[PDB]
Amino acid sequence: QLKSIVERIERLEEEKKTIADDIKEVYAEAKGNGYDVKVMRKVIAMRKRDANERAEEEAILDLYMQAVGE
Amino acid sequence: QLKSIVERIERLEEEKKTIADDIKEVYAEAKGNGYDVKVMRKVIAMRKRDANERAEEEAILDLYMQAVGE
């Protein structure tokens, strides 16, 4: 068990690095095809805000649903 | 393309969070089965050092191989 718990942790730690590299690669590939990376980052930030607001709206709709039933 | 590049980035960003949570879960599960987390972390750190030293040794063996051929 210890060996397995430890290996799971190490594999997850490795995947996290891998994923962080890939993000950098995707930016780089994008810059190479002509996209402005600074604009992309702003766009990603704004989507994150919109997604947050939609999640609040969804939570409210959901409550309304639960408050009424079938 | 932009839509796809952006979605790839967002999905990777999400997976990274997911993976960071899982690591925390694995620790927590371990603490719950009786393991000492502080000891585990030291062990993980020492394996990382050993793995680094093995990687250097492997790089040297590899060079020796390339320096001789078949």
From TrEMBL, chains A, B:
Domain of life from the UniProt record: Bacteria
Annotated protein name in UniProt: Uncharacterized protein
